[PDB]
Amino acid sequence: AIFSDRYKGQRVLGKGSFGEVILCKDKITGQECAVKVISKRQVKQKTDKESLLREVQLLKQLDHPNIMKLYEFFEDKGYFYLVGEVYTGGELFDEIISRKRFSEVDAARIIRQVLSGITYMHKNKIVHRDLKPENLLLESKSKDANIRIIDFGLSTHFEASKKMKDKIGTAYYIAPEVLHGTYDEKCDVWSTGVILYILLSGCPPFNGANEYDILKKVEKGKYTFELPQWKKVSESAKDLIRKMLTYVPSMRISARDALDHEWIQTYTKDVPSLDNAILNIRQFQGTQKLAQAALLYMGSKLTSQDETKELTAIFHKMDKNGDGQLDRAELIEGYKELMRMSMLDASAVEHEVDQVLDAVDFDKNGYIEYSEFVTVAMDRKTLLSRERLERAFRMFDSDNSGKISSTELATIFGVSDVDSETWKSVLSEVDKNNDGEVDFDEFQQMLLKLCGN
Numbered sequence: 253a254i255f256s257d258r259y260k261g262q263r264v265l266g267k268g269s270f271g272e273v274i275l276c277k278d279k280i281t282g283q284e285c286a287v288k289v290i291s292k293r294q295v296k297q298k299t300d301k302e303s304l305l306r307e308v309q310l311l312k313q314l315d316h317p318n319i320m321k322l323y324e325f326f327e328d329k330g331y332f333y334l335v336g337e338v339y340t341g342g343e344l345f346d347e348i349i350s351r352k353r354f355s356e357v358d359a360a361r362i363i364r365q366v367l368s369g370i371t372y373m374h375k376n377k378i379v380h381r382d383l384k385p386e387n388l389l390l391e392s393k394s395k396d397a398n399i400r401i402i403d404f405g406l407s408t409h410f411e412a413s414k415k416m417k418d419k420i421g422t423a424y425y426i427a428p429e430v431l432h433g434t435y436d437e438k439c440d441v442w443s444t445g446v447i448l449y450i451l452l453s454g455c456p457p458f459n460g461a462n463e464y465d466i467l468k469k470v471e472k473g474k475y476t477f478e479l480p481q482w483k484k485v486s487e488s489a490k491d492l493i494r495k496m497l498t499y500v501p502s503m504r505i506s507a508r509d510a511l512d513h514e515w516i517q518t519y520t521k522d523v524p525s526l527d528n529a530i531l532n533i534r535q536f537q538g539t540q541k542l543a544q545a546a547l548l549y550m551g552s553k554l555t556s557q558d559e560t561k562e563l564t565a566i567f568h569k570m571d572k573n574g575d576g577q578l579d580r581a582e583l584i585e586g587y588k589e590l591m592r593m594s595m596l597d598a599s600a601v602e603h604e605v606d607q608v609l610d611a612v613d614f615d616k617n618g619y620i621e622y623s624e625f626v627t628v629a630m631d632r633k634t635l636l637s638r639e640r641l642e643r644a645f646r647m648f649d650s651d652n653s654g655k656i657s658s659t660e661l662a663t664i665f666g667v668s669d670v671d672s673e674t675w676k677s678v679l680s681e682v683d684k685n686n687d688g689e690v691d692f693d694e695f696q697q698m699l700l701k702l703c704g705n
C-alpha cells in the first residue's frame with residue numbers, strides 16, 4: 253500500500269520529535285488524521301525491521317483515553333508514515349498559561365491523566381523515555397479536555413536528533429539512568445515527577461545555564477523545595493514528587509502505585525490558586541518557545557540558502573537554450589527534482605507551484621521567468637519563518653516593552669545552547685550604544701549573524 257494513494261496533505265501541524273507532522277485527509281472517507289513523517293536519511297533506526305513492524309501492530313490494537321491513537325503505518329524508500337488521531341487543543345502548558353487561576357486540584361487532575369496513560373503503556377511493555385510537556389496534547393479546545401500523550405514507543409526504535417533545534421527542553425525531564433544507559437519503564441515516572449514539580453512551582457527542579465549544566469544537575473539528582481512558591485504546596489504533593497524523583501529506579505514509585513498516592517486520591521475527588529506558579533510557568537514557556545523559534549528561524553534560513561541555489565541550478569540545467577524561460581510543467585518537474593534531491597506527492601507540488609505563480613501574478617499558462625519564481629517560492633518560507641519568530645518575540649515580551657534585556661538574552665541563548673562568548677560577540681556588533689537590550693529587528697539581526705549571515 254502507498255501512503256499518498258490513500259491520504260492527501262491539508263497542512264503542516266508542526267515539527268515534533270523524529271519528524272514533521274502533517275494534517276492529512278483520507279481521499280475516500282474524508283477522515284482527518286495527524287501523520288508523523290519520519291525521514292530515513294535524517295533519523296536512524298535502533299531496532300530491526302521485524303521489531304518495528306511488530307511494535308506498530310501492537311500499538312494499532314492499543315486503546316486508552318490519555319494515549320494518542322495510532323491507526324495506520326506506511327513505509328516507502330525514504331520515509332515512515334505514522335498515521336494517528338489528530339488533536340486540536342494544543343499543548344498542555346500553552347493552555348495552562350492562558351488561565352487566570354491554577355491549583356493543586358488542577359495539577360492533580362492533569363497528573364492523574366498522565367499517570368493513567370503511562371500505567372497502561374507500561375502494562376504493555378511500552379516506554380516513552382522522552383516524556384515532557386510538549387508530548388502532552390489536549391484532545392480538543394474544550395477547557396476540560398482530556399490529555400493525550402504523544403510519542404510513546406518511538407525512542408525505542410529511532411535515534412534522537414543531536415541537533416539543538418530538536419533537543420530543546422529535553423534536558424530538564426530526562427531520567428538520570430537514561431543518561432547512563434541502563435533504564436526501564438521507571439524513567440517515565442521520573443519525567444512525570446519533573447513535570448509535576450514544574451506544575452506546582454513553575455520552575456524546573458534541575459536547572460542550569462545550558463544543556464550540560466542541566467544534565468550535570470540531573471545526574472547528581474539533587475533538588476530542593478526551598479523556593480517561596482513551595483510554602484503554598486501540600487506535604488502530600490511534595491511526598492509524591494519525592495517518590496517519583498527517587499534516584500535508584502527500583503526504589504522509585506511505579507506509575508500504578510502513584511495513582512494510589514494520597515495526593516492523587518485527595519485532590520482528584522478548599523484550595524488556593526498557585527499564582528506564583530502560573531507566572532513562573534508563563535515565563536518558562538515563553539522562554540522555551542522563543543529559544544525554539546530562534547533555532548527554527550536560523551535553520552529555515554540555512555535551508556532557504558541551500559534550496560534557493562539548488563532550485564536555481566536545477567532550472568538552469570533544464571533551460572536548454574538558456575533564455576531563462578520555463579513553463580509551469582517544467583517548474584513543477586524541477587520543484588519535484590528539488591524534493592527528489594509537506595510535498596508528499598505530485599499534486600501537492602502542482603498546488604504549491606500554482607500558489608507561487610498566483611502570488612507573482614505570472615500567467616500560469618505561458619512560459620515563465622524561473623529566476624523570479626525561485627525568489628518568491630523561497631521568499632515565501634522566509635517571510636513565514638520570520639512571522640513565527642516575531643510572534644514568539646512578542647509573546648515573550650509580556651510587558652510590551654518592545655525589547656529584550658541582555659540578561660534575558662543570556663537565558664534564551666542558554667536554552668538554545670548558543671555559546672555565551674559567541675552571542676555576546678554578535679550582540680556587541682549589533683548593540684553599539686551599550687544599551688544592554690535589543691528590539692525585534694536587532695534580535696533577528698543577531699540570529700542571522702549566528703547562522704553565517
Ligand SMILES: COc1ccc2cc(-c3nn(C(C)C)c4ncnc(N)c34)ccc2c1
Nearest residue numbers: 265266273286288334336337338339402403
Ligand atoms: C507514533 O505515531 C504517531 C503518529 C502521529 C503522531 C502525531 C503527533 C502530533 N504532533 N502534533 C503537533 C503538536 C506537531 C500533533 N497535533 C495534533 N495531533 C497529533 N496527533 C499530533 C505526534 C506523534 C505522533 C506519533
